[PDB]
Amino acid sequence: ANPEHYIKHPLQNRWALWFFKNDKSKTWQANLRLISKFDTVEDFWALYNHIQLSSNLMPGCDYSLFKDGIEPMWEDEKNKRGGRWLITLNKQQRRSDLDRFWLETLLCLIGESFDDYSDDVCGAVVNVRAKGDKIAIWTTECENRDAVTHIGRVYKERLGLPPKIVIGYQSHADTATKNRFVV
Template identity: 45%
Template sequence: MVINDSAPERSELEVMATVKCNGDAIHHSDEEVDLSCSSPETKIDSLVSNHPLKYVWTYWYLNDQRDKSWEKRLKVVSNFGTVEEFWALYVSIRPPSLLPTACDYSVFKKDIQPMWEVPENAKGGRWLITIDKSRHHDLLDVIWLEVLMAVIGQQFGKYTADICGVVVNIRNKGSKISIWTTDCNNDESNCKIGEILKQKLINPDIDSKIQRPIFDVLRYEDHQEVQNKSSSSVKAKHIITASD
């Protein structure tokens, strides 16, 4: 994970995961909407900022209360702009595999909402990883953290400028993890992001206990196509297979 071109090795970043809110990772019951340990902003802002990230990011949570509007279901968990703030937040909330069905986590650059309609996303698209229901607990948390660290840690190099954020959708038929980019027609950037994503996912350093391949296909989809059609009928603009 690269931090402003002078990053510690990834193993050092993993050691930072020992930073915990009140000493332990907190996992809340399904009834709770607040995913923080008490007040995330207060606790995280009190940390020493030793390893700044290039961008400040916002961690969002979409709850499963489908009787409410989408906007009312969407909550900001916290902002973070350093490695220490990220780990303090990450270990204090439930991993994706423990979220109820129909919930989402989104991590977007600050001031970009995780919505198709906002200007930064309106003409964009997403690289999509679909995780089969049978491998939900095996893969979901591992891939989510791997993708999240790659994006916030600048591992996409100059192409990180074209990335708006990352999303994990918890669904009955199979969960999804996606990287959202700002321009679906920027083929050079989008293809390079897909290639780098593939390399991250086939990295042998990822948990060796997980059965390979971690993914079969990566698909790049236009947001407007996704909105207008059911996901099963969306035509991918770009496809990368694990065997390529």
């Protein structure tokens, strides 16, 4: 049997998608819920086309997709010394750019679009807030400039951001209660 006809195309890693819903009755970690995991091309699209778009999510909810074994928390061993490539979005970009940016974010991860430094990526997070939405790509170490910079430069080009726009990178240790890199 020739394999192309009947086998799902496997991804290089198995990913886990998380959902967060703000509820003051529970603690923050208690509001984190793992939705599903996948490791094939077909199983990702089956899950993506089955969940609501982040534009359609209630303000205060988050989507998170991380490599299996890494949890969307800075306390995780692969996140204590890392950081995020942060993209800030205004209220009008919710309609125009939020959904296409998040899908491109997902594709750059499951597609390992960052060459050798794709191992340094931990996951991605999109937060839907009323004051403005955020999309971030998390990395495992903030002190590897060659790794963090190349990821930010490839990320900015894949989103189509013009050189007039500038994105920053913040360490989890600094951000948890400025920009370490700029591209």
